[model samples]
Target chain A: HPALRLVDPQIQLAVTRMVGPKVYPIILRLGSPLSLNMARKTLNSLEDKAFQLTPIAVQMTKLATTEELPDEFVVVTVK
Target chain B: PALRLVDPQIQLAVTRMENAVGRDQNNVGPKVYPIILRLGSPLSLNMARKTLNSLEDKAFQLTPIAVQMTKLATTEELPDEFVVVTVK
Candidate 1:
């Protein structure tokens, strides 16, 4: 994918570690030629994998957009 | 200076941007016009704008050439042969 072309392998590996084997499927869905919802559903599915899904998804979201992980990736829950 | 604009939220946004760029300079592609990052809060948004404006000013002064280079690189336009140029 175009985004993958720009992403450093090291950074990609780190993200892969965090998200696990689901990374490629996630990336594929995100990179699809279809409209934004294709990626949206892929992102939503993260919640099903674990309880503390938001934090992980947040990191992934940043990675997807910025190609970098946060320095202090915190778990912030807004009630 | 816009760079002087400081707030916790703004600082976070700036940090995120820096990390993003560092990870992949190619993150910004020609097809990706106006990349948008969501700053969760309104406060963060204002702070990001201030910080970005300051950065733009600094970039204009410190590396004007880089700016033109980016334009040429992304737009795929070669420099005009007839235009006179000066470098300091």
Candidate 2:
């Protein structure tokens, strides 16, 4: 779950509420500090997929220090 | 005001420095994380801030370019949400 210890509990809770307990595929990965355009792009691409997709939840998290950049990532889960 | 990031481990911290400006200089202490973003922005800093706005409750605050940076980096006017920030 991207070691969400840094993420707000309320947001984590909301994510859990929507994603549920099961493991679903992460459909998209966007950089965090999400700009308005990027957010809109995410939504647009999600809707444009040929197959009808049902998204579960969205999360903002960071990579471990082991990464090259260790920048934040916004992930979208889907059923 | 000088805002510092106290806990990079837990989350962000947007806290003002003691004796900064406008505020009384008598209290020698740090600021707590007390920001809730109902609105968001396009800049990198505000974009991340906006992410937390997706949630309902108030979350911690961290402004890398609180006042000075905003003035230089942004072309459009900064949002009023930053009104919470003690501009120095």
Candidate 3:
């Protein structure tokens, strides 16, 4: 549940700071090795709900990169 | 000028980054956090066009470079570079 504990909170903080205090639902889907298409699909799903579309930016970080557990995450924003 | 390439350039850069290294997890160390740009007010189409026209050619060149930087940041071993494009 590291994704829920560590990653989700950080994403909530970052997205909240960027957009506002208002609640923006974040749907997280974890794949051992996430693919770009998966990311795009998720983002597209989010964007489709909005009236306008503007890509704000993309941010990446290496969450875990060890033999035991290797993980990384990307958080993007749109308007 | 025709819909000035600056904004389009930024959009393209974002797309390129999304395509290149956005999907998969990275096995690299020294994590980089995501940064978001907040624009207080939305820029009208006219305003966007005008602003693009105002920039110098050299300044505009940075758009593609920024895109390339994102690619390197994601795929290669280097510090991540985040560009916040905020319009007042």
Candidate 4:
């Protein structure tokens, strides 16, 4: 519900390729720090198409959070 | 058609996020994510479409070709080039 980012141009491009812009809010929710806690809500919201982000989200989990992330989250996707 | 091969050694690696930090969230099992393939020789969309399921690593899946980066092939370099291919 809050502000989120899909920083990498490649990922930003990959996302549109995989899921398109219509799913933006959904992606924000997917990578939000909140998803860290509400994974199922995150999981449940994802339709078959959203699996596209699963790998992206998982990939971002490994990246350093630094100050780039928002104050709140749903999962920390690629920053 | 121009074709170049990607080096699996330099590019492909499975990711594991140690600091997932949530008790319920287990970072176990294979961490699946989107892999960007720089399309060139050998790798064709048709090949990917037909061979996808039969290929090893059952965890992997490919979405239908979305947008072809026809402009990208000429416009960019390594990271952005095939960023290359039509990634389709």
Best by lDDT: 4
Residues A1-79, candidate 4, lDDT per residue (tens digit)? 3343333222222133333321111122232132210011122344521111232332233224323433221221221
TM-score of 3: 0.16
- The better-scoring model by lDDT among 1 and 4 is 4
lDDT of each residue in B37-87, candidate 2, tens digit only: 222322222111222444364343333322113122331232222212111
Worst 10 residues of 4 chain A by lDDT: A34-43
Instruction: List the TM values for chain B, per candidate.
Output: 0.14, 0.20, 0.20, 0.22
For model 3, state the Cα shift of residue B81 in Å: 2.3
User: Could you give the DockQ of candidate 2?
Assistant: 0.03
Model 1: which residue pairs collide? none
| Model 1 chain B worst lDDT run, 10 consecutive residues | B41-50
List fnat per candidate, in order.
0.00, 0.00, 0.00, 0.00
Model 2: lDDT equals 0.25
RMSD of each: 21.4, 20.6, 19.6, 19.1
lDDT per residue as tens, model 4, B11-60: 21232334467445344632222223333222222001122334363221
Worst 10 residues of 2 chain A by lDDT: A34-43
Chain A TM-score (model 1): 0.16
Q: Write the per-residue lDDT of candidate 1 for residues B54-81, one digit (tens) a residue.
A: 4333211111101111112221132111
